[PDB]
């Protein structure tokens, strides 16, 4: 029916990936690959490889034509954060959160 | 009349660019350096286009050193090429002869890349 794919524990933190997806979301799939290829943020190549995979499953596992496909949804969710620190003045050291993003995306046909 | 860094450094970087390009007919850089350097390298090609020893000494006053490009098996110096071919290329032509083409952002810093080729 309406196929999806996911990239779990992507190293980029979720606020950023969301800045890109929000451009991507809802658009026709072709347009989306363009916009994705032309935006200059890290999440852009990542989300690119993910939307490609999703189109792949959609052609290959569900026999739909790729052209009429549409990005039904795309979103990033909090995934577990690597926890570090940087040493600071007078011997105190303060935390750094290197957080991660699970990026889902789903493409589409009609209701059936 | 732009910058990137300090004036000496900008002078040097600007020679370093324009001495090149002449070596290599086309280059890839920031849009910014490209705009600043189009004027330099053009003023050089007018200087060679003149041909007199005086102009030669002024060019060599700006142009960076030996870069003896290997042509068809021989070594034209840098300026020696500039007065020697480049000038004989563009003589029937007016001045104004250089172009910049926009590559789009580069990955590491986002800087707008562009290509600058004299033709």
């Amino acid at each position: 029916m309406e196929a999806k794919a996911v990239a779990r524990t992507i190293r980029i933190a979720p606020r950023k990936v969301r800045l890109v997806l929000d451009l991507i979301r809802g658009k026709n799939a072709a347009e989306a690959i363009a916009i994705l290829k032309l935006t200059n943020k890290a999440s852009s190549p990542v989300i690119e490889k993910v939307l490609m995979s999703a189109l792949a499953n959609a052609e290959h596992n569900y026999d739909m034509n790729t052209d009429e496909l549409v990005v039904k949804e795309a979103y990033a969710n909090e995934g577990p954060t690597l926890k570090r620190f940087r040493p600071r003045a007078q011997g105190r050291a303060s935390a750094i959160n290197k957080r991660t993003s699970h990026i889902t995306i789903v493409v589409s046909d009609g209701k059936e | 009349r732009k910058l990137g860094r300090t004036s000496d450094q900008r002078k040097a970087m600007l020679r370093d660019l324009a001495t090149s390009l002449i070596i290599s007919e086309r280059i890839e850089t920031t849009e910014a350096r490209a705009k600043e350097v189009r004027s330099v390298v053009e003023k050089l090609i007018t200087l060679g286009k003149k041909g007199d020893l005086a102009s030669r000494r002024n060019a060599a006053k700006t142009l960076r050193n030996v870069e003896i490009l290997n042509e068809d098996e021989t070594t034209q110096t840098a300026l020696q090429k500039l007065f020697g071919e480049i000038a004989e290329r563009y003589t029937e032509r007016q001045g104004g002869y250089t172009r910049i083409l926009k590559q789009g952002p580069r990955r590491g810093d986002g800087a707008e890349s562009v290509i600058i080729e004299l033709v």
């Binding site: 451009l23 290829k37 032309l38 935006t39 | 083409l101 789009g104």
Partner: protein, 43 residues
């Protein structure tokens, strides 16, 4: 100076409403079939 109260969820998101990025201005490469930014090289 430090905040005297914590920022509200609703507050913080009202502030963020101008934090989107622009959809790129994007011409279609003729015949090459890719796409690129306006007034840029066709690669």
């Amino acid at each position: 100076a430090v905040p005297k109260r914590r920022t509200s969820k609703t507050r913080k998101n009202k502030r963020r409403t101008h934090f989107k990025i622009s959809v790129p201005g994007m011409t279609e490469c003729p015949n090459c079939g890719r796409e690129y930014k306006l007034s840029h090289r066709v690669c």
